[PDB]
Every structure is written in C-alpha cells, then in structure tokens.
Ligand binder design. Structure first.
Ligand code: HEM
Ligand SMILES: CC1(C)[C@@H]2CC[C@@]1(C)C(=O)C2
Length: 403
C-alpha cells in the first residue's frame, strides 16, 4: 500500500500519485499526469507510493534540477531503488568523454548518412502491411522497426533479431524465463566476442567505433564497451516504439492533422517536434546528495525525486493549451529528450525515425482509423506506452511507391 511519511514532510504537500499506475489512466497517460498540473496542486509535491518520493510538477523546477547535477545525482534515476549501464551513473570527467564517444556513433552526421537506409526499411515494413487494410500498428511496425535499425547501425545480421529482441524484451517485460540479471548477462555474452573481433579490425559500424574508443587517453575497456553498446541498444527501443504509437494513435484519431501533412509534408519537421511535446513519454528522477532547500522545500539526503520529462511541455506556464496539438505552434517547448548533462544521445536518430515513419506512411496510406469499437489502452511508467494500436484502411485508397 503506502510507505510511512518521513518526519520532514508537511502534510499540505502530500499528494499520492502512483507513477506506475495513475488514477486517470483511462483518459490517456499524459492527461493522467497532468492531474499534477491542476491549479490547486503545488509546484513540488510528495507521494507515498513506490516507497515515497518527491515529484516536481512544473517545467522550471524540472529543468532546474537536471541542471543541478551536484545536488541531484543520477546514481538512482529509477523509482524505486538493480542495473549497471554506462553512462548514467557516472561523474563528470569520464561522463562528457563517454557521451562524446557515443555521439560519435549516433550523432547527426551518422543519422544523416543512414536516413537513406532508414527510408528503405520503413518503406518495406509499410508495404508489407499496406494490402491488409488493417494491423496492430504497435506489434506490426513499431516493434520490428527500432530493433532492425540498431542492427543497421551496428552492422549486425538480420538473423540475430529474434534472439536479441528476446533479451531486450526480458529487460522491460519479463515473461519469467530470465531474471533481469540473466537477460543482461546474455546480452553481453552475445556482444563481447563482436567487440574483441572488431577491436582487432577497425570497421565503420557502431560497435567498431565504440570498441576503439579512448577514455582518459586510455583505451576503452571491453567491460566498458558492452555497457555503452548495451544502453545504445535498449535506450532506443521502447521509447521509440511507444512514441511512434501515440503519434500514430493521434493521426488515426484526427484526419484534419493527418491532412495538414498530406498536403504540406514540409510541416513534418515542426509537426514531429510538436508531437514530441504533446506525447512526451519518459519519467525519470534523480537522488539527493545531501540536504538541500529547493524552491521552499526541505529535501533530505538519500531522498529520491521524480523529474518527469513528460511534464515540461504539458506545463501551461510553458506552452499555451498544452493539451492542444498545433503543428504551427510558434515556440514548441519540451524536455522530451531530458535536460542537463544526461540529455538523450539518440535524440537525433529518434527524430529521423519519427519523421521517416510519418512521411513514408502517409505518402502510402493517407486514410486510417482506430478499429471500430476498440479502446486504446495506455500504460504508465519510467517509459509510458500504448498496448496496441489496431488500425484499418481501405487498400484501394493506398498507393505503392518503390525502391
Ligand atoms: C522518442 C524518442 C526518445 C525519447 C523521448 C528519449 C528520451 C530520453 C531521455 C528523457 C533521457 C535522459 C534520462 C535522464 O535524464 O536520465 C534519455 C537518455 C538516453 N537516451 Fe533516449 N530517448 C529517445 C530515443 C533514444 C534513442 C533512439 C537512443 C539510442 C539510439 C537513446 C539513447 C539514450 C542514451 C544513451 C541516454 C543517456 C545519456 C546519458 O546518460 O548521458 N535515446 N533519452
Ligand atoms: C529509461 C531510458 C529508456 C531513458 C532513455 C534510456 C534509458 C534506459 C534511460 O536511462 C533514460
């Protein structure tokens, strides 16, 4: 149920919100967190669920905290207090350095070069769906898409997907075959030999670049390698799947917006940016490194604070009618990719993945809707998401474009 209030918390601040299971889930997952952005609700509140933690409800305080790395540690970004990826729990000499490395394998220039093959892939995935007049978009496009793209990026064989995809599935959605420990170990088991192999040789692929990286002028350890690769892989899975989904959920609910883009495809940039704001999905936190008064509140050492990336951007103080999707919104503001020293390294890849998805989809399937009489179901978490997206469309009205 709820863990006991610690002595330093004013009752007028309590407000019990289960991030794993919010009251209004049925409304939709954002809408459900937006309860924390009602007027009567304090800017920074405390809930007793999940062990008891804080929660900043407004943009300014969120930004401010990820800016404040000295006070707000990334030792335990997850509520509740398991895992060991690089570079999340690491400080600050090494930190910037590892981030550089990765940025080297997923930065803009890399994405720019890949766009082409990314296009090809989305196109084959859509085409194989196009005739059917329906699908579970979530299972049939969104899930197969980001895994494949990592394979492209890391130059790995298509034939590894099933098993690889199995391991990452176990990390976030165990069926019970493997503990979180086991699925990670096995990930590494599969990775190590390719690292060594490619440390020897030097390729252009993502694993090669990472494998031959210096850190403190010293060569990167194998142990370090598999970890970065590790997060590069799983970091770009659920978030994209899930996000692609909200975005398809809304386009399918809205022919107007769907039209805006069929007519003027150059709007897709800002569009995509605006959906990233509207359907932000990640809810991470940090841990206090010692007592600290913050915006008029006494935080205790060891404390944990949810700092919901989802929130900024839905905060009225930062965008007007935050709940309205306007592709022509002048200033789109969000921390959908986080803030401060840990900002999302994949952020560039992600955008392109979205943008391609959207362009290559609509240019081929202009007309689609939710399957008659299905209630789309959201789930809440560190990464929020969509259970399924049953879609339908008359095939006559599609078009096949080739490569
Ligand atoms: C819609 C797309 C995506 C969203 C909303 C998203 C969101 C995030 C957020 C909010 C963080 C920072 C969390 C924190 O502050 O602790 C994060 C960090 C990370 N993301 Fe994702 N991301 C997405 C796509 C990806 C992709 C596609 C990759 C892999 C290519 C990825 C790799 C990472 C890595 C490595 C970090 C950690 C950076 C560090 O700790 O220094 N991001 N991203
Ligand atoms: C929880 C995440 C998906 C989000 C992006 C990568 C990830 C594993 C993080 O550390 C933050």
């Amino acid at each position: 149920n709820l863990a006991p209030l610690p002595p330093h918390v004013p009752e007028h601040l309590v407000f019990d919100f289960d991030m794993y299971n919010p009251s209004n889930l049925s409304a939709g997952v954002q809408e459900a967190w937006a309860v924390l952005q009602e007027s009567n609700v304090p800017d920074l509140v405390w809930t007793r669920c999940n062990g008891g933690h804080w929660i900043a409800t407004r943009g300014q305080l969120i930004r401010e905290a990820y800016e404040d790395y000295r006070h707000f540690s990334s030792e335990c970004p997850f509520i509740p207090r398991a895992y060991d990826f690089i570079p999340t729990s690491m400080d600050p000499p090494e930190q910037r350095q590892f981030r550089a490395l990765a940025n080297q394998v997923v930065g803009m220039p890399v994405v720019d070069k890949l766009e082409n093959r990314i296009q090809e892939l989305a196109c084959s995935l859509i085409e194989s769906l196009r005739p059917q007049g329906q699908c579970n978009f979530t299972e049939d496009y969104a899930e197969p898409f980001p895994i494949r793209i990592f394979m492209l990026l890391a130059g790995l064989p298509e034939e590894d997907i099933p098993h690889l995809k199995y391991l990452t599935d176990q990390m976030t959605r165990p069926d019970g075959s493997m503990t979180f420990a086991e699925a990670k170990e096995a990930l590494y088991d599969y990775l190590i030999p390719i690292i060594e192999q490619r440390r020897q040789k030097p390729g252009t692929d993502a694993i090669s670049i990472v494998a031959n990286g210096q850190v403190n002028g010293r060569p990167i350890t194998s142990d370090e390698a598999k970890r970065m690769c590790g997060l590069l892989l799983v970091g770009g899975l659920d978030t994209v799947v899930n996000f692609l989904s909200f975005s398809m959920e809304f386009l399918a609910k809205s022919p107007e917006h769907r039209q805006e883009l069929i007519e003027r495809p150059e709007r897709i940039p800002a569009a995509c940016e605006e959906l990233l704001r509207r359907f932000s999905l990640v809810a991470d936190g940090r841990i206090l490194t010692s007592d600290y008064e913050f915006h008029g509140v006494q935080l205790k050492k060891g404390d944990q604070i949810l700092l919901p990336q989802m929130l900024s951007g839905l905060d009225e103080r930062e965008n007007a009618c935050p709940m309205h999707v306007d592709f022509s919104r002048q200033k789109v503001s969000h921390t959908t990719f986080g803030h401060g020293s840990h900002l999302c390294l994949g952020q560039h890849l992600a955008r392109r993945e979205i943008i391609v998805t959207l362009k290559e989809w609509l240019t081929r399937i202009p007309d689609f809707s939710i399957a008659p009489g299905a209630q789309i179901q959201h789930k809440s978490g560190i990464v929020s998401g969509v259970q399924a997206l049953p879609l339908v469309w008359d095939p006559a009205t599609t078009k096949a474009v080739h490569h």
